[PDB]
Design a protein around this ligand. Structure first.
Ligand SMILES: C=C(CCC(=O)O)/N=C/c1c(COP(=O)(O)O)cnc(C)c1O
Ligand SMILES: C=C(CCC(=O)O)/N=C/c1c(COP(=O)(O)O)cnc(C)c1O
Lengths: 422, 424
């Protein structure tokens, strides 16, 4: 029995990928670049296009699909809960939202969980919490709160996010901007210490590995050292684990690699296994409780459907031991790429990452990075770079041993064929 | 039926009573909402049930997110069917749903370009970005000088930039420093608008056809019609927020249709998904929308195929079930009856107001405790949540049947009269 999208789409008589591309240019706000594929279905680490070609998905929603496409447990949890109750608002109680927050609070070790919808909203929320806490508990002067963040950060596309970006296309022509941000180099403890001299600082807002910035892995101890500096000044450490969290780097949180318990933790993306948007902000009671009744809200935040989904998605990460999976396969991946590609392929600048969050930065003055992207696709690997030159390898963590060996060999083959063609 | 996971995790916690749940929420959930009166376990259509099997009519409906009713079978079927196939690709890859869904909405609402985001706040943020970038690039106003006019008591969400353009104390207090670039004028005041529009740095006027969270404030006839002519006169964009008013709630497809206004930029949300998953939209002509070039905006989940499949079903339900006609007809009956039976008899009613099935009864909180009205309503089978303490809201699913609406209207009228009896 055809649902409305199916019947409608049928009537458009779209046969080729080009037919779909034309439909984007005509009707879809054109804020994303052209795409090389029209995906129709996904299962685990694999997707298929409209012509039945199979690929490994090496983007995975930039770590939103860690549990794989269409994970049966998560889809069942979705459909069962959807037959019962999807939305009450937080104006009314329900039998799911609190149990879901207790589940998360225990899993991550926080007193209070705020559920929002997108990663941007989690960042907005955290900044609001840190500002209000700074005014109310730190007693900094009215409208003086500052938040330190890093160059090449990414946390979203709200105006306030654009206001704290150093990426030209993120901010250009979108001002005037929200004040109150101090930008410093990533991976630079000395710069953080200098900025922490300002007593009106509320928080330092950081990624454990910069995501959209290029899979920038900081030096050993960066985050550990930053937390001590912040504690010294009674400044909150807000750690954005939207992309790095949830087993992706080989630990439950990327912050775990430094034994850092964030003062405020952000999650999103794979919190729902890519099924529906749900994000979370977690913290100790004497920070989070500054959000009194009426001072924050969201129509869909903490809706029971997304809660049911998230509990199942997080349980899958545990049950399937996906952190161990990510540690093991990712160390193998980087070891194979280094052995077969360094030396042999001179236009590779770096192979880096943790767990299954991996990147290969190329030198865009020695090669066209897009040739690498297209060659990957020809070998069945779908992959989207960041900043042009940073190739990304972010597969679902459920990828099997056999599938990962196959994908690894396809990836190596692609880089070597580009070098041969150069 | 076999237990669900979440039923067994929760059954593991031994939560039996509504108070066990209230405690759980107090301990683990960020405490940014008021205490709740009820623990809902199931919804179907206009009805919800608490964990004790008590039935109520849902007269909040997600503040008009559940116009198609709780658990609409078509919408749930479309969700589950698409979810078995594909949920997310990002807009970094193509898929076989997002484009067709945007074409579907483009044709339904009469726009060149559709931008899909996730929440109403994100739709507002996106619209403000589009308008500013358009002002800089097309009107060539000076850098960082773009202004946006909004109205006192507006509500568009909870981002910092939304807090920065709010006149509601709890929405902004201690969340600054604030995003600049806003001019706040009285709602429902064409003269104030005309004056604000003299400033050539204005990019847009951003307005609700009926203020939602501000208290179901219905403007005077022709307000929006007059406001658009003023903005066009000045090449200023009219951004109309229909996240709460749109989608049949006021008796027309868009509340702007009461004034025959086609917004320069339209925002939808809430019932765009029948309350099933968060999806919002921003729609506009090509020469405005196309300022958002590749890399200049984005969203992980915006336009995901699951949400698109749900939205197309949700929008089709509105048409097939003639829910605008139903809202028009039942709404008019609701306001007629409440006025006939309550005005005069109940001196602490200030006003009964609305359009379609977006209705409010503002009470005098110096003369009555408005929470007594909320509790009495609940005792009589009606779940409602006020805005601004004193503004009672009646916002049922538009699928409420003729008999259900009769029964509910009776229970509502009964509750106001019982509160007045008790005052006496
Ligand atoms: C991959 C993305 C964006 C994808 C896209 O916009 O196509 N990352 C989003 C992100 C965000 C924003 O999340 P969103 O609003 O996209 O849910 C926050 N924090 C971190 C560390 C992030 O990496
Ligand atoms: C009912 C609400 C908020 C409910 C809540 O936060 O509990 N309205 C949200 C809203 C919004 C924000 O939508 P949200 O971010 O909550 O999806 C935008 N525009 C209008 C006219 C709106 O009424």
């Amino acid at each position: 029995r055809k649902t409305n999208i199916e019947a409608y789409r049928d009537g458009l008589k779209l046969k080729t990928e080009e037919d779909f591309f034309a439909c984007d240019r005509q009707y879809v706000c054109q804020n994303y670049a052209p795409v090389p594929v029209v995906i129709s279905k996904g299962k685990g680490a694999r997707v298929w296009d409209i012509n039945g070609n199979e690929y490994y998905d090496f983007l995975a929603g930039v770590s939103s699909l860690s549990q794989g496409h269409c994970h049966p447990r998560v889809i069942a949890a979705l459909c069962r809960q959807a037959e019962r109750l999807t939305l009450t608002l937080r104006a009314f109680g329900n039998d799911v939202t609190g149990p879901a927050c207790r589940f998360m609070a225990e899993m991550f070790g926080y007193d209070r969980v705020l559920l929002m919808n997108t990663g941007a909203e989690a960042g907005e929320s955290a900044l609001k919490i840190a500002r209000k806490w700074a005014y109310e508990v730190k007693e900094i002067p009215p409208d003086s709160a500052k938040v330190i963040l890093c160059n090449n950060n990414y946390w979203g596309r709200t105006i306030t996010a654009c206001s704290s970006s150093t990426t030209f296309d993120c901010y250009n022509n979108f001002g005037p901007f929200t004040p109150g941000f101090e930008l410093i180099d990533y991976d630079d403890v000395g710069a953080l210490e200098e900025a922490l001299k300002d007593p009106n600082v509320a928080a330092f807002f950081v990624e454990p590995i910069q995501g959209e910035g290029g899979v920038n892995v900081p030096k050993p101890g960066y985050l550990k050292r930053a937390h001590e500096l912040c504690r010294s000044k009674n400044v909150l450490l807000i750690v954005d684990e939207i992309q790095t969290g949830l087993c992706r780097t080989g630990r439950l949180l990327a912050a775990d690699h430094d034994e850092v318990h964030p003062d405020i933790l952000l999650l999103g993306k794979s919190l729902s296994a890519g099924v529906v948007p749900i994000s979370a902000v977690m913290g100790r009671a004497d920070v989070m409780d500054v959000l009194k009744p009426g001072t924050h809200g969201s129509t869909f935040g903490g809706n029971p459907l997304a809660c049911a989904v998230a509990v199942e998605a997080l349980t899958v990460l545990k049950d399937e031991k996906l952190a161990d999976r990510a540690e093991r396969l990712g160390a193998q991946f980087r070891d194979c790429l280094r052995r077969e590609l360094y030396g042999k392929v001179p236009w590779i600048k770096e192979i880096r990452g943790r767990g299954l969050l991996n990147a290969v930065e190329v030198d865009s003055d020695a090669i066209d990075p897009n040739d690498v992207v297209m060659k990957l696709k020809e070998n069945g690997i779908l992959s989207k770079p960041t900043r042009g030159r940073v190739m990304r390898f972010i597969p679902p963590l459920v990828i099997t041993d056999e599938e990962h060996r196959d994908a690894t060999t396809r990836i190596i083959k692609s880089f070597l064929a580009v070098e041969e063609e150069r």
